Design a binder for this molecule. Sequence first.
Ligand SMILES: CC(C)=CC(=O)NCc1cc(-c2nn(CCCN3CCOCC3)c3c2CN(C(=O)CC2CCN(C(=O)OC(C)(C)C)CC2)CC3)ccc1C(F)(F)F
Length: 220
Amino acid sequence: ILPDSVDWREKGCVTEVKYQGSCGASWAFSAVGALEAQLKLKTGKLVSLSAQNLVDCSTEKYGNKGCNGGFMTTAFQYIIDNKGIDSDASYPYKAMDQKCQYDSKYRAATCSKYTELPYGREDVLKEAVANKGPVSVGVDARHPSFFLYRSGVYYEPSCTQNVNHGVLVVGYGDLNGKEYWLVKNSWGHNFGEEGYIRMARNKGNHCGIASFPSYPEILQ
Ligand SMILES: CC(C)=CC(=O)NCc1cc(-c2nn(CCCN3CCOCC3)c3c2CN(C(=O)CC2CCN(C(=O)OC(C)(C)C)CC2)CC3)ccc1C(F)(F)F
């Protein structure tokens, strides 16, 4: 039986919240965020991986369009194919499309595989968050209430299951009888609760949080 509440920040597995700015790279930030947690678990080191590396390099071949959108799964596929991803320190985020300047000399992580979860199964997402670590998910963030969110458990009656914003589910919980998903965003500290939003859990795949989940792994 799973833990009632999970918060991977308490295990030192989550990097600082990032700020994507006018570049639509949330897919890239969700992908590194998931891989940072696996890297921490394996090596004991928490390091920001280069979202910019994904923006500039995981491009046409992976169905991604850099600052105009992308997918976490094919981002993971690029890191597998590329046999590494640079540290964010060595490949900083500039919030625009650049030439791919990946440099294996500054490889901070690798990716062995990635696993996708079934559409809509919040129970399965719960299990994956408890047993594997933070999970990359899309959410429907095209709502003013989302941008304007400050605290508490978010619920948007007009939310759809059609995701359009990549985020990181770093845990789950319960606040005053309202179940939520603990979601790491890429809009800086001033969005929501220190850059995090707690979104309704077990409310029929609210905002599509469980539409398209996936997490990577770094194998021995
Ligand atoms: C480049 C761009 C701009 C990308 C983008 O958008 N990224 C957002 C996003 C998409 C998906 C996602 N992954 N996958 C599966 C992988 C597909 N491939 C990826 C690359 O190659 C390998 C496989 C789907 C979706 C979105 N998706 C839906 O939501 C379902 C549809 C329901 C209703 N619609 C419909 O009927 O569409 C018609 C009308 C026919 C056009 C529209 C949407 C369709 C299927 C998952 C996560 C994210 C997020 F980044 F946010 F995290």
